[PDB]
Design a binder for these strands. Structure first.
Lengths: 138, 120, 48, 178, 82
RNA sequence: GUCUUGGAGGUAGAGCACUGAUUGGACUAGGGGCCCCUACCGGGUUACCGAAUUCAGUCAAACUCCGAAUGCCAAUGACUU
RNA sequence: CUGGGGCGGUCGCCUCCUAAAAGGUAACGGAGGCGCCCAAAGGUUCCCUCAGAAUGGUUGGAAAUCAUUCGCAGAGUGUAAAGGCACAAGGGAGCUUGACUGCGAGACCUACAAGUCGAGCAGGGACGAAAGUCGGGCUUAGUGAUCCGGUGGUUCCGCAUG
RNA sequence: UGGUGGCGAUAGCGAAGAGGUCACACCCGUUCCCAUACCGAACACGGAAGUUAAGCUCUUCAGCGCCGAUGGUAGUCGGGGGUUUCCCCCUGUGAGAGUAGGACGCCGCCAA
């Protein structure tokens, strides 16, 4: 449950999501994360559906990171009214999610805890996923 | 502690705002004054070419004063250099004020050029 | 208070202009000088 | 020239022998003193800013300049214009009679005067000095205004570090609080 | 059915006033013709170009038109004759 | 029209150079807590918020230090029409 | 005008975005403003450069002022966005009224009506030693046809002639 | 060696030495010519006691800022395909960042 504090504008365009994200296709702060696979809008409530239902399964766990952040106001005209006549009420918030962008990072956790604590948040997120760990070179 | 602008330092910030007003030549080369502490010079320059056409200074072993670095007797170079380009014949020149005030004895250099002939 | 009032001649008595001026900020019978073509020179032009 | 003949005879070589510099001219000096009223009539409602003229010209006959407010203030008076406090940024040889009127004449007319400002340097060489009284300076008349103000006097040195400047002012002989 | 809800608060727009390169890089250009309309000085004038009241660029003595660079990222219109 | 060549413009992309928004860590001006005392100066406890600043890392139609692909304006060499 | 109409709201002008790298380019799409103000906030000559921060001080305070470094601009630029500006178009002095008559080669834009830029000439100036600049405000808003009446001037006409 | 120019910070910030007879400098004074919202700091003026300290020149550094590739990718003209909020090839273009690297300057004119 997060929202941007004071935005430059209250009603914004919807954009065209395509291609790979500009950056952050690589978990680097913590150990294990989920990387998304499709392009989608992720609302505010679903990261709230994530940071809860990971700390269910992460009773004594490390810090849970979220590299996503919502800044796009998805917008509704009030229902059962005609087309046109002004752009509608800002219905809440919605985040920018390209495919390939590693969503979360979770640290202080072994393999086998991270294959279910990170799995159950992916049932709440509307995007097909894959588990992604780290790598050195480097 | 108090950092000061040198009298050469900020002077070329005052000189370039004259350089954005005049074209250097127009069969009329530009003419600047260099007022040092000791003795004061005069060159005849022109863009585009950058050719110093003819020149002298108060430092000149020919035609000494010999008061050397004081009032308009040191503007004999203002009389001399206009007589020097008079044999070039060129010209009714453009006059740079340098970064100094056209006041005297900086004015008195260019004063000495006009009855030495050159129309400006 | 801004009122557009002509600035007539004194050599000939001839209006010839419009100027913007303020009633408060310039309450006097204001006077500039301009060029009257029927007087061919620089000419004292009071407000009228 | 009693302060002026003081350091032009002994003080500038005395710092050279204390610790070195090249080029014996490389020695800090007295640069400039900026006397201030800062008053602004408290708060513009006197209306006499210009009362501070008569109060200031007899410290030294230097004509002063009222400092104009360079900003509009939301919490007090006023917007820009309507100046706030006077100023003499004196220099030169009138400098070296202002300070002879300070040390042995008017600075003991501070009532509890012993020594002062261990830390009032600006860190890198200026010397700040606040003044809270105005019977201090000698040609001020007690027959005159009888109203109470305050002042600053900002003594400026030449040294890079106030290390060298504080030790300069002690060769000047400035009574500090120790 | 329908309820009547408005309104839009934002419908207005100015008349579109034009800019851009009115000539090209290499044009013969008569005296006093407008090279390049500007809001300000987006490009400076050089040889035989003036500056208008709208700070516009227009050529005095005829000939070719070259768009140049000051250095580092600053353009400059000069007019070279035949 | 087609190739060469010259250009204007800040888009798609990108990245943070600014205008903003933002994740996390160090740093801690200020604050609160808790006590001592404050009858007052003040001090100590923070796994308490926290401005700057800094190490990384995200994102912008009304953000660009940068900037393509074509597209338009022409030249003079043609090769067709 | 209209996502049937009504009610609501808008009708014109300037700026931005949507606008697809020339330029335009729509909707009851997303933001602001405009029906003025400056006798100087105009012209010119000549100077100078910001905001914020830290350091210390007079009642001095989280900040009015004052000093030393930082500070390419985070300041201002009448008013609001875009562009632009420190060699200044930004601040300060002095002298001033070019906030100019007759124009105008030529261009830009476009249904037309319009609107915009102007090098250069003459008349006389202003500022400046000159060089030279000056036909209003850094630009882009702040304004509206025709008809009808009034005012100033008219080596114009005037109903057989004056 | 000084003065004036022309070239995109490859020219610059920063650190460190070295130079002054001549030149540029600080420096000295303010009766003059003229200035400060005040004042010989500046601006103006005439003089030569002191100086490398600062300016300025040269020399070393790549800490910063700058320039700047090749290859490869994002994007994309033009076809062609699809599982069509998007994705895939093929032809040609090709970014941005990064990087190999360059660079803390050249080229004049006059004057001694």
């Amino acid at each position: 449950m997060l929202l941007p504090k004071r935005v430059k504008y209250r009603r914004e365009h919807r954009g065209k999501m395509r291609g790979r994200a500009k950056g952050g296709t690589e978990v680097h702060f913590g150990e294990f994360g989920i990387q998304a696979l499709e392009a989608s809008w992720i609302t505010n409530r679903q990261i709230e559906a994530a940071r809860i239902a990971m700390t269910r399964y992460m009773k004594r766990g490390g810090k849970v990171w979220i590299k996503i952040f919502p800044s796009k106001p998805y917008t509704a005209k009030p229902l059962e009214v005609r087309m046109g006549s002004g752009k509608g009420a800002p219905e809440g918030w919605v985040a920018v999610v390209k495919p390939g962008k590693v969503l979360f990072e979770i640290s202080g956790v072994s393999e086998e805890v991270a294959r279910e604590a990170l799995r159950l948040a992916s049932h709440k997120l509307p995007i097909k996923t894959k588990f992604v760990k780290r790598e050195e070179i480097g | 502690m108090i950092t000061k602008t040198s009298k050469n330092a900020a002077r070329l910030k005052r000189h370039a705002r004259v350089r954005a007003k005049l074209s250097g030549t127009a069969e009329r080369p530009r003419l600047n004054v260099f007022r040092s502490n000791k003795h004061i010079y005069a060159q005849i320059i022109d863009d585009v070419n950058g050719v110093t056409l003819a020149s002298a200074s108060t430092l000149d072993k020919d035609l000494n004063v010999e008061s050397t670095g004081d009032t308009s007797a040191a503007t004999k170079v203002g009389e001399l250099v206009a007589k020097r380009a008079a044999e070039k014949g060129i010209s009714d020149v453009v006059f740079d004020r340098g970064g100094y005030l056209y006041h005297g004895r900086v004015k008195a250099l260019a004063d000495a050029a006009r009855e030495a002939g050159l129309k400006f | 208070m801004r009122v557009n009032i002509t600035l007539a001649c004194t050599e000939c008595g001839e209006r010839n202009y419009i100027s913007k001026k303020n009633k408060r900020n310039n309450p006097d019978r204001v006077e500039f000088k301009k060029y009257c073509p029927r007087d061919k020179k620089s000419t004292l032009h009071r407000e009228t | 020239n009693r302060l002026k003949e003081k350091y032009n005879k002994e003080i500038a070589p005395a710092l050279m022998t204390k610790f070195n510099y090249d080029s014996v001219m490389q020695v800090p000096k007295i640069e400039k003193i900026v006397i201030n009223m800062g008053v602004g009539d408290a708060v513009q409602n006197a209306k006499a800013i210009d009362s501070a003229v008569e109060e200031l010209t007899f410290i030294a006959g230097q004509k002063p300049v009222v400092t104009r407010a360079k900003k509009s203030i939301a919490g007090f008076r006023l917007r820009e214009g309507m100046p706030i406090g006077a100023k003499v940024t004196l220099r030169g040889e009138r400098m070296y009679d202002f300070l002879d009127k300070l040390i042995s004449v008017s600075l003991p007319r501070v009532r509890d005067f012993r020594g002062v400002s261990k830390k009032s340097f600006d860190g890198r060489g200026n010397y700040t000095l606040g003044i809270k009284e105005q019977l201090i300076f000698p040609e001020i008349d007690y027959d005159k205004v009888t109203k109470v103000r305050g002042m600053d006097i900002v003594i400026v040195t030449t040294a890079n570090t106030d290390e060298e400047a504080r030790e300069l002012l002690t060769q000047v002989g400035m009574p500090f609080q120790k | 059915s329908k309820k009547g809800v408005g309104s839009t608060k934002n419908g207005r727009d100015s008349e579109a006033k034009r800019l851009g390169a009115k000539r090209a890089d290499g044009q013969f250009v008569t005296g006093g013709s407008i090279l390049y309309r500007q809001r300000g000085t987006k490009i400076y004038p050089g040889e035989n170009v003036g500056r208008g009241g709208d700070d516009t660029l227009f050529a005095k003595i005829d000939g070719t038109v070259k768009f140049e660079r000051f250095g580092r990222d600053r353009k400059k219109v000069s007019v070279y004759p035949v």
